[PDB]
Enzyme design. Structure first.
Site, PDB file in Angstrom:
ATOM      1  N   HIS A  68      -1.317   7.923  -8.177  1.00 41.97           N
ATOM      2  CA  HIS A  68      -1.481   6.602  -7.516  1.00 41.97           C
ATOM      3  C   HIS A  68      -1.163   5.467  -8.490  1.00 41.97           C
ATOM      4  O   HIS A  68      -2.007   4.561  -8.703  1.00 41.97           O
ATOM      5  CB  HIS A  68      -2.858   6.494  -6.890  1.00 41.97           C
ATOM      6  N   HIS A 106       0.439  -1.385  -1.655  1.00 41.57           N
ATOM      7  CA  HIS A 106      -0.441  -0.598  -0.753  1.00 41.57           C
ATOM      8  C   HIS A 106      -1.515   0.171  -1.534  1.00 41.57           C
ATOM      9  O   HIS A 106      -2.512   0.532  -0.908  1.00 41.57           O
ATOM     10  CB  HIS A 106       0.387   0.312   0.162  1.00 41.57           C
ATOM     11  N   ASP A 107      -1.323   0.475  -2.811  1.00 39.29           N
ATOM     12  CA  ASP A 107      -2.312   1.267  -3.595  1.00 39.29           C
ATOM     13  C   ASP A 107      -2.754   0.492  -4.852  1.00 39.29           C
ATOM     14  O   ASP A 107      -3.242   1.143  -5.804  1.00 39.29           O
ATOM     15  CB  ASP A 107      -1.773   2.648  -3.971  1.00 39.29           C
TER      16      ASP A 107
HETATM   17 MG   LIG Z   1      -3.698   4.763  -0.651  1.00 37.44          MG
HETATM   18 ZN   LIG Z   2      -0.046   5.553  -1.451  1.00 36.76          ZN
END
Ligand SMILES: [Mg+2]
Ligand SMILES: [Zn+2]
Ligand SMILES: Cc1oc(-c2ccccc2)nc1CCOc1cccc2cccnc12
Length: 313
Positions: A68, A106-107
């Site tokens: 991530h 988004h992360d």
């Molecule tokens: Mg996520």
């Molecule tokens: Zn993601």
């Protein structure tokens, strides 16, 4: 105004394909993203000075976790770029702006742990956001960065266009909460099959954008086998870290996160392709026919995992 980004020939050609890998040179990923905004949106969508400063602040706020991370952010934006480019006329000027930015953010500030681990740890974010815990945090971090002096890439939008784009980004980021994907796809399945699907219905567009976000977010499963296989190592490196932390709280983790059950990975990947990935790209291919190469790549990789189980690799 007349300053294009240009990539080397091999990247110029392969970046248009769904299965493009952005490569190991981190210092090229900003330029790859700007290139994608320019071809997807126009060279006038964003002030280059402001976009560059936004990109570098976003990078700074991704952490050094195995999966991530900043590479995932740019990989997910590229898959969205490929979907938008192969579906030119289906998306508004605002949607193209918002979705590439949504994918990059988004992360934001991911710690490498699931919503479940935050809740069982009793993390402060779990008190502030009872559902889609990390996804509400990612959107919160996106707004914070947009509000830094010199970072408002949307400043040249009208008041109401600005409200629409932040609303697109919020729904887009929330939809990356995989717990929400199953219901969203069942609904889209029903609407496509009973013929009620209507891309002028804003609630229907929201759902379709939601499924595109799940498709981009899982796009590791749509790369060539060696990329897919080597990314699974990073995915499992986080899961097993989380499993270790579950055991520290005195809770046996699910086998997916137990590093003692590495042997069960191939079967776990099968179930994931069958329960999540294949259904996602199938419904996406029904709604947006030109995204079929993602379904075809996913099926190839399902077959490669079947071959792992049969001891053939
Ligand atoms: Mg996520
Ligand atoms: Zn993601
Ligand atoms: C939950 C998840 O998400 C991804 C993934 C996500 C994004 C891109 C590619 C894979 N892979 C998984 C793994 C699902 O695997 C599993 C699911 C269930 C049990 C398992 C037992 C052992 C090993 N794996 C397992």
């Amino acid at each position: 105004g007349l300053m294009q980004f240009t990539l080397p020939v091999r990247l110029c050609k392969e970046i248009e394909l769904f299965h493009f890998d952005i490569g190991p040179f981190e210092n090229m990923w900003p330029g790859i993203f700007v290139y994608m905004v320019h071809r997807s949106c126009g060279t006038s969508c964003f002030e280059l000075e402001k976009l560059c400063r936004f990109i570098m602040s976003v990078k700074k706020n991704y952490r050094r976790v195995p999966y991530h991370n900043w590479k995932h952010a740019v990989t997910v934006a590229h898959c969205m770029y490929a979907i938008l480019q192969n579906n030119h006329t289906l998306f508004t000027d605002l949607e193209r702006k918002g979705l590439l930015i949504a994918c990059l953010c988004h992360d934001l500030d991911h710690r490498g742990f699931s919503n479940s681990y935050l809740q069982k740890f009793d993390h402060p974010l779990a008190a502030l956001y009872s559902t889609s815990t990390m996804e509400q945090h990612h959107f919160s971090q996106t707004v914070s960065i947009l509000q830094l002096e010199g970072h408002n890439i949307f400043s040249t939008l009208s008041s109401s266009e600005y409200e629409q784009v932040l609303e697109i980004i919020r729904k887009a980021i929330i939809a990356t909460d995989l717990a929400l994907y199953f219901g969203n796809r069942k609904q889209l399945e029903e609407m496509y099959q009973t013929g009620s699907l209507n891309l002028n219905n804003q609630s229907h567009r929201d759902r379709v954008i939601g499924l595109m976000m799940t498709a981009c977010d899982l796009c590791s499963v749509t790369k060539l086998w060696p990329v897919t296989k080597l990314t699974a190592n990073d995915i499992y490196a986080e899961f097993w870290a989380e499993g270790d932390e579950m055991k520290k709280l005195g809770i046996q983790p699910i086998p997916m996160m137990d590093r003692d059950k590495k042997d069960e990975v191939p079967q776990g990947q099968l179930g994931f392709y069958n329960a999540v990935a294949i259904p996602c790209y199938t419904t996406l291919t029904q709604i947006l026919p030109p995204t079929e190469p993602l379904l075809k790549a996913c099926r190839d990789n399902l077959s490669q995992w079947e071959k792992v189980i049969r001891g053939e690799e």
